[PDB]
Every structure is written in C-alpha cells, then in structure tokens.
Design an enzyme around this catalytic site. Structure first.
Site, PDB file in Angstrom:
ATOM      1  N   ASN A  46       0.848  -1.174   0.000  1.00  0.00           N
ATOM      2  CA  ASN A  46       0.000   0.000   0.000  1.00  0.00           C
ATOM      3  C   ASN A  46       0.886   1.227   0.000  1.00  0.00           C
ATOM      4  O   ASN A  46       1.226   1.766   1.062  1.00  0.00           O
ATOM      5  CB  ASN A  46      -0.863  -0.003   1.253  1.00  0.00           C
ATOM      6  CG  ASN A  46      -1.801  -1.177   1.291  1.00  0.00           C
ATOM      7  OD1 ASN A  46      -2.626  -1.354   0.395  1.00  0.00           O
ATOM      8  ND2 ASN A  46      -1.635  -2.029   2.285  1.00  0.00           N
ATOM      9  N   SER A  51       2.422   0.334   4.141  1.00  0.00           N
ATOM     10  CA  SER A  51       2.128  -0.895   4.870  1.00  0.00           C
ATOM     11  C   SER A  51       1.910  -1.983   3.822  1.00  0.00           C
ATOM     12  O   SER A  51       1.752  -1.688   2.637  1.00  0.00           O
ATOM     13  CB  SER A  51       0.876  -0.742   5.743  1.00  0.00           C
ATOM     14  OG  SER A  51      -0.304  -0.659   4.957  1.00  0.00           O
ATOM     15  N   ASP A  53      -0.178  -5.914   3.168  1.00  0.00           N
ATOM     16  CA  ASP A  53      -1.186  -6.910   3.555  1.00  0.00           C
ATOM     17  C   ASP A  53      -0.568  -8.283   3.263  1.00  0.00           C
ATOM     18  O   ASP A  53      -0.118  -8.527   2.141  1.00  0.00           O
ATOM     19  CB  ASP A  53      -2.455  -6.716   2.720  1.00  0.00           C
ATOM     20  CG  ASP A  53      -3.091  -5.370   2.943  1.00  0.00           C
ATOM     21  OD1 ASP A  53      -3.175  -4.943   4.109  1.00  0.00           O
ATOM     22  OD2 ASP A  53      -3.476  -4.722   1.950  1.00  0.00           O
ATOM     23  N   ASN A  60      -2.861  -6.608   7.610  1.00  0.00           N
ATOM     24  CA  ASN A  60      -1.989  -5.445   7.478  1.00  0.00           C
ATOM     25  C   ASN A  60      -0.887  -5.267   8.524  1.00  0.00           C
ATOM     26  O   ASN A  60      -1.124  -5.396   9.733  1.00  0.00           O
ATOM     27  CB  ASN A  60      -2.872  -4.199   7.404  1.00  0.00           C
ATOM     28  CG  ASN A  60      -2.092  -2.963   7.054  1.00  0.00           C
ATOM     29  OD1 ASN A  60      -1.673  -2.215   7.935  1.00  0.00           O
ATOM     30  ND2 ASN A  60      -1.880  -2.749   5.764  1.00  0.00           N
TER      31      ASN A  60
END
Length: 130
Positions: A46, A51, A53, A60
């Site tokens: 992201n 971050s 996933d 996350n």
C-alpha cells in the site's frame, strides 16, 4: 499455496474458526476468497501508507504483524509478517481470531463489508462437509 475451496473450509473448521466470536465458516471463506483467492503467499503493498497486507486474509503490517519496514506500526498479533506467508495457516488463523476479538469483529476487513456482508454466502461451504 493456493487452497481449493472445500480443502480450505475443512482446514479452517479444524482450526476452530466455525462460529469463532459468532462468525460462521462461510463468512471466513468469503473473506479469504475476496482477500487473496485462498492464496497464503499473497502480498499487497500500500504505497499510500507504506504498509503491506500478508497472506490468505491479507492482514496489514501497520497494525497486526511486524515486518520492520512499516512506519509507525504495531504488532497486535505478536508475529513476524513472515508467519502470515506459510502454507500452514495456523498462525494466520490465530491472528485473524485476534483481529475479531476487537469491537468491529469481521467488519475489520473492508472487503468483507463490500463482498460478504448481507449476502447469501452459503455457496462458499456447499459440498465441503463442514
């Protein structure tokens, strides 16, 4: 690994997911389906908040597992994000359970709301023997 539907359903049942905090197996299946297509290797970066996933439930790094590279992050499941990429989903399941022990429950996953909430999710478990 990429699980086959019924294979995953029985695996999750054996791990105590059916009805965990009131969440049915079909809901967990629908979540895993839309989050990673039942892929334990799945990772999504992201760029927006730096971050990532991880795994079958796309948990996350900013809040649940530690990958060392996510700014201002915590590790609520107390696991390395690496544990969320194993073929064996016991750790991922332990972490998913931890996520739902919070107020939102299954609603923590944005995708569950869009793809599973208020829907007929019986198809995810039909014929699996669970």
């Amino acid at each position: 690994k990429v699980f086959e539907r019924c294979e995953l359903a029985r695996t999750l049942k054996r791990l105590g997911m059916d009805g965990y905090r009131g969440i049915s197996l079909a809901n967990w299946m629908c979540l895993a389906k839309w989050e990673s297509g039942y892929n334990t290797r799945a990772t999504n970066y992201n760029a927006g908040d730096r971050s990532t996933d991880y795994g079958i439930f796309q948990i996350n790094s900013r809040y649940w597992c530690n990958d060392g590279k996510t700014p201002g992050a915590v590790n609520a499941c107390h696991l390395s994000c690496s544990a969320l990429l194993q073929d064996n989903i016991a750790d991922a399941v332990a972490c998913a359970k931890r996520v739902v022990r919070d107020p939102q429950g299954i609603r923590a996953w944005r995708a569950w709301r869009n793809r599973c909430q208020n829907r007929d999710v019986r198809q995810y478990v039909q014929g699996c023997g669970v």
